[PDB]
Design a protein around this ligand. Sequence first.
Ligand SMILES: [Zn+2]
Length: 27
Amino acid sequence: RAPRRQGCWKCGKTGHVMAKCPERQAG
Ligand SMILES: [Zn+2]
């Protein structure tokens, strides 16, 4: 899943997305 949304689809930053961001729930 390439970073097509340019960064997370919630934080708004590259280098990681909503799947790799530091806060993606992950329960
Ligand atoms: Zn991020």
